[PDB]
């Protein structure tokens with residue numbers, strides 16, 4: 238712990254503080270994650286360390302070291318410059334170019350495809366959790382709510398409201414990889430439109446917003462939906478809107494991929510592995526962003 | 530779907546990386562297989578008491594075994610290892626794990642709260658934070674997807690047999706989780722429906738019925754001698770209508786192997 242000069246605070250958490258730091262001996266720039274310690278080591282810390290230890294991929298943030306003392310617990314990460322959310326605001330006027338939106342999605346889906354292939358659900362993808370550098374790399378971060386399956390992961394009675402999948406909101410017993418694809422779906426659209434796709438202020442409001450855009454799900458489109466714990470027969474029946482009115486700047490492939498990512502029934506929603514071969518990425522490249 | 534095959538292949542690769550040292554119990558000067566049998570059974574009770582998932586139990590066992598694989602422990606401290614492992618598994622696997630005070634309370638205050646937390650810390654160090662272990666339970670749930678159609682009794686019985694394996698370090702430390710699960714699933718499938726280790730699973734696992742024989746022979750004996758065994762929590766647990774009272778199903782006399 239003595240080798241790390243704290244450079245500047247960069248984050249606020251319930252577990253603890255995140256600082257940008259540098260190794261005094263090697264000059265390597267890192268992200269330090271402080272965790273204050275009466276319930277022992279926080280479970281999220283246990284999960285994050287354990288699961289990241291396994292996942293070594295260019296599109297997942299690299300945990301470099303875990304400094305483990307009697308009184309404090311530190312997580313050493315490779316440093317990335319800023320999150321996607323900050324870049325999205327910095328782009329509010331000019332917008333993110335399509336080449337770069339395409340690159341970001343491609344890379345995210347690759348990280349995610351790697352997670353899912355190693356029985357890891359992220360569960361909480363959002364602009365704040367996705368890190369970018371100046372060379373066009375984007376990486377999945379914050380695995381505090383990440384979870385191992387191989388035994389199906391049961392849902393509570395967690396996720397940020399806006400990027401939640403409808404099956405969770407409707408009260409499904411189990412999670413699945415489908416929920417991570419949904420999230421990426423929303424992030425994809427948001428990069429295209431410059432606006433959050435489903436920005437609900439409450440659970441029921443979040444559900445209703447999804448409905449007004451994709452239509453109110455029925456038994457034909459989603460078998461079992463009307464039997465789900467939190468479904469109500471008195472739900473307004475909205476009609477599916479045209480994706481050309483939802484995401485105007487997107488070509489036919491964009492709309493195609495997006496719709497499959499925002500597919501209602503989890504079982505039929507596209508997986509990260511399958512989305513990578515979609516015609517949308519036929520000409521993917523690696524553009525560099527302009528960061529302040 | 531498209532990930533199912535990769536996840537199997539991955540758990541397969543990882544189950545080798547997370548296995549304990551087979552003959553660790555011979556190098557533990559102050560504890561025996563018998564002592565561990567008492568410990569794991571008590572955990573089964575704790576698992577029922579606090580209504581914790583079965584995965585939590587399997588993980589805790591793996592932590593305990595891996596810990597003991599490199600750390601000499603006195604008999605009086607064995608339970609402290611057991612408790613903390615159980616706490617860590619709860620933190621890893623459960624949605625809302627029981628509070629530390631609850632893990633203290635269940636030891637008749639043999640250890641303080643200060644002690645349990647320090648043991649948690651030490652186990653984390655010894656295991657080098659590597660908590661996401663493959664378990665018999667994990668492999669069974671995979672193998673279940675290969676049923677035509679799904680049979681609840683088969684599943685509960687296979688589960689019961691896999692759970693029983695946890696108790697007796699001799700012989701079951703000899704076998705990888707994938708193997709025990711295979712033996713378990715076949716035995717349950719044979720007991721309930723008469724069918725055998727399916728063609729689909731042979732291809733997936735690479736394990737032939739012939740290759741499952743050694744383990745299958747041992748598991749068959751544990752199943753047979755189950756009501757005589759010194760530890761009984763699992764049998765009691767699986768008498769329950771929740772698990773289709775499978776512990777009361779008569780084992781086949783011979784396996785026709």
Ligand SMILES: CN(C)C[C@H](O)COc1ccc(Nc2nccc(-c3cnn4nc(N5CCOCC5)ccc34)n2)cc1
Pocket residue numbers: 247248249250251255268270298314315316317318319320322323368378379
């Ligand atoms: C909105 N702005 C004010 C944010 C600022 O632009 C500043 O954002 C940022 C964001 C990231 C960096 N660098 C970085 N590189 C690698 C890894 C990490 C990293 C590892 N765990 N966490 N947990 C986090 N947490 C997320 C959950 O809450 C606790 C912190 C936030 C970041 C990280 N962070 C630097 C700055």
